[PDB]
Amino acid sequence: MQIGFNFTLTGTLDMVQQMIKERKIDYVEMLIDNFVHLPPEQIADSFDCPVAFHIMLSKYLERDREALAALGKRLRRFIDVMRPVYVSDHILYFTHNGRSLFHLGEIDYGEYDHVRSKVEQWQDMLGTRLYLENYPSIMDGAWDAPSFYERLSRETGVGVLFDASNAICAQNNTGAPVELWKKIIETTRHFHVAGYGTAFIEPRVKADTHDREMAEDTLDFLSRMRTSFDKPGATITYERDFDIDYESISVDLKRLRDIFPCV
């Protein structure tokens, strides 16, 4: 199991290169569509390790074909220059009737035909195999999502970028057990994990804040299914987007290394 960290803001560069030097992470996962006006070589040179791509705002389920295609062609040159270990994106509801959501929506998993056609078009554009992330469900779509992603993957050839903490938000929020994801967990070699928070007015509802250390139920998940997660060529990206404190990240990185020892 390789351990990664997510690079989303240029001000974290020095801290990420330090994590690489000290061998606390083995690769960097970039939120790559934040950087498609950089020279791609310059990012390749800033990390002395393999890189992976995470795409956040393609909005490939709703975006017009012309602007989608241009972004794809630009990402395609980034893939050529950097050879990312994988390329990944989301299944997110961004806009209702022309109005942007600020807290993004879980997709109605009944709408399989629509997602499938859009996913195929976007994977085509990118020219490589695509990994799609699971949503940190609040509402009961959580129970629908495992088989939806399993079917989506077998019909289109996409992969799942299994986000362990999102699945545990889903479990805490909706009851849907993380064991539903067993089959996906044993297939994909690529994972994500992070700390999560709570709704301000209701601590029982979990929110994917990526702002703190991993919870105990999240660590028990990884630890009790460590054989199902770990695999030839398996990777797990730790994600911290807020309270990006070096020391708080270093313990969570070490916690992952304890759960997945090097040999």
Partner: protein, 194 residues
């Protein structure tokens, strides 16, 4: 233990109310939908006021005297909540009970916030800089450049002053997009989206 999904089941049943504070009470307090709407709404509240805290010196600590009437107004005029979001709050402010307390100490943060949001969320490959103009900021503009080097020490949003004077926009605000990271030729202001 779990909170019931009450009148609904999936997020898709809630889409229409995710940005409407007046319709939140229609869900049971104990229902999960009430909570889900509250999280979406606090996301709107915090995007507005975390980025522009001086707006709370107008509303007061809860932000309500801006948040509620503005959210109702954005639904009425069917605003998109795009990068222009903050600019539209300032527009609403100019016709509100607070219009007498606007000054450049309030104008520049909302201009910086919209320029910042455009350059973080816009994904047009051909647009590299946004230029914002305002009738309350003559001769200067607020420019938002997309990141084009992992090693830039400067802020991505700057106030740039023009040597040749600029036409005041038609509305309170105007904008235009730049294909590279220079500004040559002024193409005319465009009005705010939505």
């Amino acid at each position: 233990s779990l909170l019931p999904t009450a009148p609904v089941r999936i997020d898709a049943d809630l889409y229409d109310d995710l940005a409407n504070p007046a319709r939140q009470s229609l869900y049971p307090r104990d229902s999960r939908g009430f909570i889900r709407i509250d999280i979406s709404l606090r996301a709107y509240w915090h995007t507005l006021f975390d980025t522009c805290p001086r707006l709370l010196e107008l509303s007061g600590p809860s932000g309500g005297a801006i948040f509620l009437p503005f959210m109702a107004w954005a639904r009425e005029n069917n605003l998109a909540f795009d990068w222009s979001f903050f600019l539209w709050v300032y527009v609403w402010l100019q016709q509100s009970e607070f219009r007498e307390r606007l000054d450049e100490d309030q104008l520049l943060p909302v201009m910086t916030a919209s320029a910042t949001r455009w350059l973080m969320i816009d994904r047009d490959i051909d647009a590299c800089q946004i230029v914002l103009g305002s009738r309350s900021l003559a001769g200067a503009a607020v420019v938002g450049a997309k990141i084009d080097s992992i090693h830039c020490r400067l802020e991505q949003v700057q106030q740039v002053a023009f040597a040749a004077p600029l036409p005041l926009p038609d509305g309170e605000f105007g904008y235009f997009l730049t294909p590279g990271f220079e500004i040559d030729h002024f193409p005319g202001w465009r009005p705010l989206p939505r």
